[PDB]
C-alpha cells in the first residue's frame, strides 16, 4: 500500500536535506512526496504510517514526532537507499544514516551507560543491536577480554572491537568523511588480547618473565612482579609448586601454562583458560 514521504522544512535545512530531496525526485515520482513546514508538522495529532525526513534529530518538532511514534529517518538514509537501490529500513527507532547498515552488534564487559550509548549510536547509524550473541551478529563490542560471550564470539571468528570504533564511525560520519563503516580500518580499534588481564608468572627465568612482561604490556594487559590478590587474574606457571602457585590455588586464580599466553598472542584473542590448566 502507498505511503507518503514528507520532508520537514525549516529555516536552516542542511545540504544533506536538499541532496536527498533531489535524489528522491530523481529515482521516484513526486506523487507521494510532500514538503511540510514546522507549523503543519506540529499540528499532526497522530502517526499515519508515513515516512518523515528530519534534520537534525533534535528540536520541538523531532521530539513531537518521536513521541507520536513516527517513522523518522535522516536525509542520509534517503541518499543511501536511493543510491544502492535498497529498501528504507524498518525504523522502529529513528535512523539518522546508513553507515552501519548490515552491521549487527552485541556487547560484553561494558559499563551500563557505555553499552546504552553504543546501542544508541549504532541504532542511529542503521545497525542492529542484540543483547545476546546470535549467529546474525557481525561484530562484538567489548571492554575487556575473558567473558563467556567474548569467548563464544572468538570461536565464531568474529571481530571483537572497542567502543572507540563506534565513536569514530559516528564522528567521522558527521564530518562527512565516511559513507560506510568499512571506510575506517578495523584493526586500529581491535580489543587488545589481554585488556583487563593482570598477569603474574612463577618459575620462569628472568629473560622469560621479561618477555612475558613486555608482550603483556604490548597486548594491552598489565604485568605484576608480585602476586596480589583481588588483582591478579592469571598466574602463568608450568610446574605446580611454590608459594605463588599454592596461594593462587587457594584463591581460585587461573593457573595456566605459558602455552595459554603465547597461544593467546598467536591466535589473536585471550584463550579459554580451562584447556590450559595445571
Amino acid at each position: 500500500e502507498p505511503f507518503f514521504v514528507k520532508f520537514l522544512k525549516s529555516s536552516d535545512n542542511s545540504k544533506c536535506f536538499f541532496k536527498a530531496l533531489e535524489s528522491i525526485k530523481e529515482f521516484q515520482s513526486e506523487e507521494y512526496l510532500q514538503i511540510i513546514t514546522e507549523e503543519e508538522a506540529l499540528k499532526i495529532k497522530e502517526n499515519d504510517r508515513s515516512l518523515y525526513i528530519c534534520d537534525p534529530f533534535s528540536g520541538v518538532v523531532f521530539d513531537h514526532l518521536k513521541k507520536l511514534g513516527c517513522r523518522i529517518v535522516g536525509p542520509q538514509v534517503v541518499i543511501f537507499c536511493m543510491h544502492h537501490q535498497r529498501c528504507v529500513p524498518r525504523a522502529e527507532h529513528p535512523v539518522y544514516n546508513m553507515v552501519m547498515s548490515d552491521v549487527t552488534i552485541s556487547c560484553t564487559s561494558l559499563e551500563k551507560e557505555k553499552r546504552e550509548e553504543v546501542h544508541k549510536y549504532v541504532q542511529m547509524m542503521g545497525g542492529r543491536v542484540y543483547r545476546d550473541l546470535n549467529v546474525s551478529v557481525t561484530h562484538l563490542i567489548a571492554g575487556e577480554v575473558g567473558s563467556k560471550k567474548y569467548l563464544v564470539a572468538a570461536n565464531l571468528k568474529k571481530p571483537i572491537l572497542l567502543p572507540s570504533w563506534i565513536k569514530t564511525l559516528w564522528e567521522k560520519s558527521q564530518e562527512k568523511k565516511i559513507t560506510r563503516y568499512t571506510d575506517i580500518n578495523m584493526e586500529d580499534f581491535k580489543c587488545p588480547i589481554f585488556l583487563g588481564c593482570i598477569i603474574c608468572v612463577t618459575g620462569l627465568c628472568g629473560l622469560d618473565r621479561k618477555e612475558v612482561q613486555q608482550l603483556t604490556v604490548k597486548h594491552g594487559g598489565q604485568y605484576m612482579g608480585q602476586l596480589k590478590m583481588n588483582e591478579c587474574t592469571h598466574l602463568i606457571v608450568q610446574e605446580p609448586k611454590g608459594q605463588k602457585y599454592e596461594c593462587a590455588k587457594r584463591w581460585n586464580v587461573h593457573c595456566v601454562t605459558t602455552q595459554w599466553f603465547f597461544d593467546s598472542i598467536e591466535k589473536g584473542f585471550c584463550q579459554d583458560e580451562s584447556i590450559y590448566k595445571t
Binding site: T202, G225, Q226, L227, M229, Q243, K244, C247
Partner: peptide, 9 residues
C-alpha cells in the same frame, strides 16, 4: 594476600 616476586636467584 600478597606474595613478593621470586628474587633474581
Amino acid at each position: 594476600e600478597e606474595i613478593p616476586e621470586t628474587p633474581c636467584e
